[PDB]
């Protein structure tokens, strides 16, 4: 019964998921004055030409755009990573107000939203096996600010009415996740966790410095989604973000000078 409400939000998750207080929790604040350039980092390689989106699902916590991950169709490589990581889904976290919504922060700045493209390490065979490994996942995080519309997001926006409530899914084929990337692939990276229960410490985080712009109308449509199921009291799906967690014995590395 974890969530983002008045009585089940992030500050409560540790009772059922004690790693919530662990050594490698996410998100974190990215201090641009202490993150150090690492010349040994490599460009990243985002290969989404062959991506097969399948479906979009309201899971009661966010919505996931799901992909075929039964081949190396959409992979992330390079950067801080060893080996190959398959895209399985992307989702967002967002606010009730434009001044909030992101999970990671940059010098304490909150963005309006944050996109997570989730990939699993093919060495481990399946996502469920991967989340049990410290190097099981690579999550590419992208900040959203409110300004211009993002044309490549509109198809997502326009399907949300069909998945308003928890448990609803819709066919969602032929979506191109390249339309959600900023121009630059400069990034910060650090080791951390899933930001939702079970909060497993299995993630190499790769957070892009350049935000994307979305329009106020696009974010407004995200804020019409519901946490609840159909036939239940309406609870708008807003403020589905976990706040920054202690960095502890970690360093954030920058790919850029
Ligand atoms: Zn996420």
Curated annotation (Swiss-Prot):
Where does the Alpha-carbonic anhydrase domain lie? 1-256
Changing residue 62 to F: what effect?
Answer: Reduced activity
Record-linked Pfam families: Carb_anhydrase
What Enzyme Commission number(s) apply to this enzyme? 4.2.1.1, 4.2.1.69
Could you say what the effect of mutating residue 103 to D is?
A: Normal CO(2) hydrase activity
- Entry keyword set: Acetylation, Cell membrane, Cytoplasm, Disease variant, Lyase, Membrane, Metal-binding, Osteopetrosis, Phosphoprotein, Zinc
What does the UniProt record report as the effect of altering residue 59 to A in this chain?
Reduced activity
List the residues marked with site Involved in the binding of some activators, including histamine and L-histidine.
89
Effect of altering residue 61 to G?
Answer: Impaired activity, not rescued by 4-methylimidazole (4-MI)
Cofactor field: Zn(2+); Co(2+)
The keyword Cytoplasm is assigned to this record: yes
Cofactor binding remark: Zinc. Can also use cobalt(II) with lower efficiency, but not copper(II), nickel(II) and manganese(II).
Effect of changing residue 198 to A: reported as: Normal CO(2) hydrase activity, but impaired stability
Q: Tell me the outcome of changing residue 116 to E.
A: Strongly reduced activity
What catalytic activity does the UniProt entry give for this protein?
hydrogencarbonate + H(+) = CO2 + H2O; urea = cyanamide + H2O
Binding of Zn(2+), residues: 91, 93, 116
Tell me what the record says results from residue 103 to A/Q: Strongly reduced CO(2) hydrase activity
Which cellular component appears as one GO term in the record? cytosol
Q: Where is this site: Fine-tunes the proton-transfer properties of H-64?
A: 4, 59, 64
Top EC class, one word = lyase
Q: Which disease is it linked to?
A: Osteopetrosis, autosomal recessive 3: A rare genetic disease characterized by abnormally dense bone, due to defective resorption of immature bone. Osteopetrosis occurs in two forms: a severe autosomal recessive form occurring in utero, infancy, or childhood, and a benign autosomal dominant form occurring in adolescence or adulthood. Recessive osteopetrosis commonly manifests in early infancy with macrocephaly, feeding difficulties, evolving blindness and deafness, bone marrow failure, severe anemia, and hepatosplenomegaly.
What is the stated purpose of this protein? Catalyzes the reversible hydration of carbon dioxide. Can also hydrate cyanamide to urea. Stimulates the chloride-bicarbonate exchange activity of SLC26A6. Essential for bone resorption and osteoclast differentiation. Involved in the regulation of fluid secretion into the anterior chamber of the eye. Contributes to intracellular pH regulation in the duodenal upper villous epithelium during proton-coupled peptide absorption.
More info: Target of drugs used in treatments against glaucoma disorder and breast cancer.
Question: Know the name of this protein?
Answer: Carbonic anhydrase 2
Q: Which organism is it from?
A: Homo sapiens (Human)
Biological classification of the source: Eukaryota, Metazoa, Chordata, Craniata, Vertebrata
């Amino acid at each position: 019964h974890w969530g983002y409400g008045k009585h089940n939000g992030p500050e409560h998750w540790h009772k059922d998921f004690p790693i919530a207080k662990g050594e490698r929790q996410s998100p974190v604040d990215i201090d641009t004055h202490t993150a150090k350039y690492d010349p040994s980092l490599k460009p990243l390689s985002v290969s989404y030409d062959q991506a097969t989106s399948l479906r979009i699902l309201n899971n009661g916590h966010a919505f996931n755009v799901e992909f075929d991950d039964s081949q190396d169709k959409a992979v992330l490589k390079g950067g801080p990573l060893d080996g190959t990581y398959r895209l399985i889904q992307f989702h967002f976290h967002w606010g009730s107000l434009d001044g909030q919504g992101s999970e990671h922060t940059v010098d304490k700045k909150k963005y309006a939203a944050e996109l997570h493209l989730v990939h699993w390490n093919t060495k481990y065979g399946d996502f469920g096996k991967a989340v049990q490994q410290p190097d099981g996942l690579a999550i590419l995080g992208i900040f959203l600010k409110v300004g211009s519309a993002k044309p490549g997001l509109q198809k997502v926006v326009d399907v949300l009415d069909s998945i308003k409530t928890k448990g609803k899914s819709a066919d969602f084929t032929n979506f191109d996740p390249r339309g959600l990337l900023p121009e630059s692939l400069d990034y910060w990276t650090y080791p951390g966790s899933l930001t939702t229960p079970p909060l497993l410490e299995c993630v190499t985080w790769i957070v892009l410095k350049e935000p994307i712009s979305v329009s106020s109308e696009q974010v407004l449509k995200f804020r019409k989604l519901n946490f609840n199921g159909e036939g239940e009291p309406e609870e708008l799906m807003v403020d589905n973000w976990r706040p920054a967690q202690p960095l502890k014995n970690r360093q954030i590395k920058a790919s850029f000078k």
